[PDB]
Design an enzyme around this catalytic site. Sequence first.
Site, PDB file in Angstrom:
ATOM      1  N   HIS A   1     -18.013  -6.237  26.506  1.00  0.00           N
ATOM      2  CA  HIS A   1     -19.006  -5.626  27.081  1.00  0.00           C
ATOM      3  C   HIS A   1     -20.669  -6.461  26.972  1.00  0.00           C
ATOM      4  CE1 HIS A   1     -17.947  -2.212  29.351  1.00  0.00           C
ATOM      5  NE2 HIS A   1     -17.186  -1.620  28.207  1.00  0.00           N
TER       6      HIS A   1
ATOM      7  N   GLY B   1     -15.168   4.557  22.365  1.00  0.00           N
ATOM      8  CA  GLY B   1     -15.840   3.442  22.017  1.00  0.00           C
ATOM      9  C   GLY B   1     -16.888   3.104  22.721  1.00  0.00           C
TER      10      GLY B   1
ATOM     11  N   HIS C   1     -12.423  -5.080  23.647  1.00  0.00           N
ATOM     12  CA  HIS C   1     -13.063  -4.446  24.838  1.00  0.00           C
ATOM     13  C   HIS C   1     -14.643  -4.296  24.743  1.00  0.00           C
ATOM     14  CE1 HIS C   1     -13.083  -1.167  28.328  1.00  0.00           C
ATOM     15  NE2 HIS C   1     -14.328  -1.008  27.681  1.00  0.00           N
ATOM     16  N   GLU C   2     -15.024  -3.848  23.679  1.00  0.00           N
ATOM     17  CA  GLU C   2     -16.454  -3.665  23.387  1.00  0.00           C
ATOM     18  C   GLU C   2     -17.275  -4.960  23.332  1.00  0.00           C
ATOM     19  OE1 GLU C   2     -17.462  -1.039  24.007  1.00  0.00           O
ATOM     20  OE2 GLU C   2     -15.546   0.426  23.865  1.00  0.00           O
TER      21      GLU C   2
ATOM     22  N   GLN D   1     -23.786  -0.937  27.661  1.00  0.00           N
ATOM     23  CA  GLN D   1     -23.384   0.345  28.488  1.00  0.00           C
ATOM     24  C   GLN D   1     -24.255   1.379  28.851  1.00  0.00           C
ATOM     25  OE1 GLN D   1     -19.371   0.749  26.463  1.00  0.00           O
ATOM     26  NE2 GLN D   1     -18.839   1.184  28.669  1.00  0.00           N
TER      27      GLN D   1
ATOM     28  N   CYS E   1     -12.449   2.563  30.817  1.00  0.00           N
ATOM     29  CA  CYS E   1     -13.800   2.220  30.638  1.00  0.00           C
ATOM     30  C   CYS E   1     -14.690   3.497  31.203  1.00  0.00           C
ATOM     31  CB  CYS E   1     -14.140   0.859  31.123  1.00  0.00           C
ATOM     32  SG  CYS E   1     -15.833   0.245  30.604  1.00  0.00           S
ATOM     33  N   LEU E   2     -15.738   4.019  30.269  1.00  0.00           N
ATOM     34  CA  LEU E   2     -16.619   4.701  30.550  1.00  0.00           C
ATOM     35  C   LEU E   2     -17.720   4.169  31.588  1.00  0.00           C
ATOM     36  CD1 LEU E   2     -17.786   6.245  27.187  1.00  0.00           C
ATOM     37  CD2 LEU E   2     -16.176   7.254  29.057  1.00  0.00           C
TER      38      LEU E   2
HETATM   39  O1  LIG Z   1     -15.789   2.346  28.191  1.00  0.00           O
HETATM   40  C1  LIG Z   1     -15.497   2.301  26.924  1.00  0.00           C
HETATM   41  C2  LIG Z   1     -14.776   3.431  26.259  1.00  0.00           C
HETATM   42  C3  LIG Z   1     -13.408   3.373  26.347  1.00  0.00           C
HETATM   43  S1  LIG Z   1     -12.602   1.832  25.553  1.00  0.00           S
HETATM   44  C4  LIG Z   1     -10.875   1.877  25.739  1.00  0.00           C
HETATM   45  C5  LIG Z   1     -10.291   0.493  26.046  1.00  0.00           C
HETATM   46  C6  LIG Z   1      -8.940   0.872  25.895  1.00  0.00           C
HETATM   47  C7  LIG Z   1      -8.140   2.133  26.159  1.00  0.00           C
HETATM   48  C8  LIG Z   1      -8.994   3.226  26.135  1.00  0.00           C
HETATM   49  C9  LIG Z   1     -10.389   3.064  26.124  1.00  0.00           C
HETATM   50  N1  LIG Z   1     -11.062   4.421  26.039  1.00  0.00           N
HETATM   51  C10 LIG Z   1     -12.499   4.447  26.032  1.00  0.00           C
HETATM   52  O2  LIG Z   1     -12.909   5.548  25.939  1.00  0.00           O
HETATM   53  N2  LIG Z   1     -15.849   1.431  25.991  1.00  0.00           N
HETATM   54  O3  LIG Z   1     -16.718   0.485  26.497  1.00  0.00           O
HETATM   55 NI    NI Z   2     -15.895  -0.159  28.382  1.00  0.00          NI
END
Ligand SMILES: O=C(C[C@H]1Sc2ccccc2NC1=O)NO
Ligand code: NI
Length: 166
Positions: free
Chosen positions: A137, A45, A133-134, A50, A91-92
């Site tokens: 952000h 995601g 989660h997104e 980001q 998270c990336l």
């Molecule tokens: O940083 C990202 C990509 C993350 S989202 C995530 C949330 C819970 C568990 C694994 C993930 N993996 C992603 O790549 N999205 O903002």
């Molecule tokens: Ni993230």
Amino acid sequence: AILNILEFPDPRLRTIAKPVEVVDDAVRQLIDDMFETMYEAPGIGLAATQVNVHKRIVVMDLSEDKSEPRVFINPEFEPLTEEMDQYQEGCLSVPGFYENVDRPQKVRIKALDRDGNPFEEVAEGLLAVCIQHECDHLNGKLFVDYLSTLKRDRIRKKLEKQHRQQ
Ligand SMILES: O=C(C[C@H]1Sc2ccccc2NC1=O)NO
Ligand code: NI
């Protein structure tokens, strides 16, 4: 194009994203770059915040083979139950760290699709975790915000050190 992904503690990750007023071709081109960035990282995601574009845009692909791209513009969600579930999140923008986060287990998503049309969607499991989660952000919030202050500081310090060495 592969866009650069901001990393915690860059203050730009705390910016509140602005709603998208028209889903035109520029928005779809940003979405295409976001997916490329996301698939190359790789991640499942990615929120525009980001990549330092402060617009309410989220892309995702929860498949193991790039066969299920999903677009959420101006996403919102509402918990469908009071039950909570734990999931180890990464998270990336906080690379290399994975910590448990508790979140509502089932939510109803509302958003605009890639054409600008409104839809809704019940989400449970990985989808419900990722959408929350997104959306976080887009409101300038990171999963480390749910962690204890000491754990978040340990994470920050490691990343800060990495950034200096890089
Ligand atoms: O940083 C990202 C990509 C993350 S989202 C995530 C949330 C819970 C568990 C694994 C993930 N993996 C992603 O790549 N999205 O903002
Ligand atoms: Ni993230």
